[model samples]
Target: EEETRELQSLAAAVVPSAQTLKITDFSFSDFELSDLETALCTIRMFTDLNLVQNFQMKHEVLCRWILSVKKNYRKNVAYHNWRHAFNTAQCMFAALKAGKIQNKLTDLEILALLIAALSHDLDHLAQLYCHSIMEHHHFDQCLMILNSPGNQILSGLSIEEYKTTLKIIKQAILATDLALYIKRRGEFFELIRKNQFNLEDPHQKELFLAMLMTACDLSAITKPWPIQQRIAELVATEFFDQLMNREKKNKIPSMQVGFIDAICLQLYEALTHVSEDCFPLLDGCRKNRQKWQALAEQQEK
Candidate 1:
């Protein structure tokens, strides 16, 4: 009964007009999407990006995989829910299409990166870990889902392709841990600075895509002012709820300033040199930093 009912709703996710939702727009709001629509839009991203055709993924299998991914998210969470997962994937989609970084990546990298972004936050509410522990858990859950019946989207690939794609997906998901990000981003920046970053080299590409994962993971900091402010509120609420101490919310603006300065700015700046199309991301982060700076100062005074 449960299995059949699941199929019925997965069938419902196949929207004919899913492509019309502006899924590649960087400023697109996840809040505007219903759960079913989120799945439809995700399918739109895969199809529009040619991941479906290029990878020869079966349409129904992809649909079920997407639905399975969405189902794994903790629906009641404040920030780490399906909405956030879809938004993260949309940022990567926009960077690939609108930002034109697709030209630098292989078909396999693109496929794995999107999968990593969409499933990166799975099992966020799992108390079974801390720090990168949760990230590990998320990747574990992602693997479990991928291996499940009706959700094996990667089954279409050959052995070598499957191994390579899954490896990239795992690395990309693990890179979302801020601790690892901090530990590794300077190497990326140094490579960009030295003008020695080669996408064709496997190691260099891994570093580049790792940075991409970090950039997309924190892409909310690069949103336009209004959207950034709204997301900041949502993020703060979630953090405060987790901390169980509302008083700490007042420091959000200041923390955001530090986040932009210490984290977002450098990554986006490095990316801009890699692809000038990424300049808007850097510009948006710069603008948001000024807004945060003002708010942080206001709180101080």
Candidate 2:
């Protein structure tokens, strides 16, 4: 019983934004509650169809964690808001979908992978890693405030049952640290090149999960231009917000860097050089940007 109508709506929202190079013109409806519920159901079914067990508890714990974090997130920072959580979830879903099609992963693994991705940054503050690090705060300390406290609350739901769930949740959430993104990607590719999937190792499983998560996190750059620009704005806004917050706390002046444009251009070039497979994604983003530009021009007409 696939919810065809709901799925169609979800697909519409995801249709290549008009800003991208129109590979083929199409449009889906905006994301409504029905679409989101259908997507969740689809995710659940996909997991079950793959015979994934022992992980059901993980999903429950994760949902609880998401709710808890949302309740406590700081209100001022736009980028660290709930929409960011949803965006990351969408990216995780896209990555898992790609993995399944490529035959690189099983359904159960994909489910776990998405859970990991969705939960990667359960609750985030406005600060970036460097800011937190420089301020003499342990990264885990912030995560503990945002995520661990929620985990502690979730523990009472079923202590022993959720122990492993908690362990996996923490590992997955903490893995969202973007500073290690490149190194992590290289390590995963190397393992794949060596066909190291043979060892039946838990470490290998973690590595695979980490790689997929990281790929999706960076996948925004490969999106069509309008969407990419939005993503770029989101990233820049996040950094600017962090800079301002740090300035307020320490009486330091804001850095004069042309933060948004400079960072976006650098990220654009870096991702383009890293993966040829990213071409379609990047082109899509570029096209979307052009569309927006055109729209702006028309507004003055």
Candidate 3:
């Protein structure tokens, strides 16, 4: 009986949709929980979905899998919620629109990125999944959903292509784990400094894709001034809930301040020189970084 309910929850549960919502609208800040799936499917994933539809295939299967993947991402603390997943995917959409990597990748590759972003932070139960366990679960849970009946979203791919795309999705999602950035970026930065980064090589392409995932994952920091501030504070609530006492409480603000300067700010700054076409994301980060510096200064005072 328990297995039946569990199966039904994933297989038959119809995730509610918000027909009236556009992710571009910011007037109503709290999209609550219900608006998540719709924002992703029809809005965030819409461009890639159009390409799938143009091929006239996987319409129902993709819907079922998309909704199933959406259903799996239950509400977590704050920064790792389904909403955060939506924002990350939206950054991908914006990045795609920016045309840096637009024609550089095929539509299927783009679709895989969009799908991976949407399905990235999922199954966060008692512990957060997308951080440590995400390395394992993101791909596993994604494959689990694709394995479900009527959820064969990747059926559109040829066998070898599907296998290759799955591997890329796993690698891309794991690379979004921020610690990897801190560890791997020392080498990445040196390449950036020398102005000798090469994406024409396949290995460099993997590294480039990894960096793209970071930029998208930290998208909140890319928002213009006022919007960036709002997201930073909400994420503070998430951090505050995790910390235990007065000592940690006092440090949270400091950590938030330092974090922007150290991680988010630096990451976006790196994007600025990723290519001549990469300036928009980088310049936008510059705007946020200045104000972020202002905020950090204020917090220190």
Candidate 4:
């Protein structure tokens, strides 16, 4: 009884509307480190911007729980840490804003998208949870934290509302798995080829959400050239480190395939002219694809 009462105490706490600090003006990537920084509190600003603004979400509990979740995970690897999660969430935020997708989704969808973006990388250790089996694993990690007592950030939701949003959250994060990307990209591409994509169809709208998830997951590629360059190096570094880990375990590194044909070239290229949101991501991924292809060719020596 005491524990349940205490949980309610945390859940029922409120932030005065006037006192809730809006940090939308700040960038999360500005903080670079293993430590949780003020940049994370900026995530609160995001909840404030979309969720609280529309849903009457309380910052004291909601954002606090979010920040706690953020603060808890610290990856030992260089690439797939807090910085990566922060960067990915910023990309989603940019997409929702710059891509003019506000009117396309419900208030809950926007909130779910942001949460999925921010939490997508919560438990990554190396090689960028950019892959499916890995992304599925990371998402389970997100659920573990949310399901923990006194840490239920999803407190105020009604049973149906909770179930529906959790489903969206699952779809948003699981969509990042690259294996699913090929099927979705191919299906969407054929529709685009025939000009049969029906935006009025709610299912197509979910397809757009999948695309947004892709854009945000690979947001590093779409970032500024300097930023892209740095992350590219980090990705390569992490890949090599994973290779070393495999060797230490006496496991042969499997032949790396499917990146260009299955993912980068196919998904990025196919999505390029599909919508207004595509260009910002399309150009960057295309560039990185070209760059990596050239480097791969040279390595044949």
Q: Highest TM-score: which candidate? A: 1
lDDT of 3 by residue, 76-119 (tens): 56677667777777677656655356566666567667767877
Please give each candidate's TM-score.
0.89, 0.51, 0.76, 0.72
Span of ten consecutive residues with least summed lDDT in model 2: 21-30
lDDT of each: 0.80, 0.42, 0.62, 0.58
Positional deviation of 152 in candidate 4, in angstroms?
3.5
Which residue ranges in model 2 land beyond 4 Å of their true spot? 1-66, 74-76, 101-112, 123-126, 129-161, 193-199, 241-301
Please write out the lDDT profile of model 2 over residues 70-133, one tens digit for every residue: 4444363555454444445555543333223224554445544445454444333446622131
Tens-place lDDT digits, model 1, residues 116-179:
9988878534332112323442588888888998788888799999999889999998888877
Off by over 4 Å in 3: 1-37, 40-50, 54-56, 123-137, 242-253, 299-301
The RMSD (Cα, Å) of candidate 4 is 6.7
Candidate 4 or 3, higher TM-score: 3
Clashes of 3: 0
Q: What value does the lDDT take at residue 59 in candidate 3?
A: 52
Residue 286 lDDT, candidate 2, scale 0-100: 48
Q: Poorest 10 consecutive residues of model 4 by lDDT?
A: 248-257
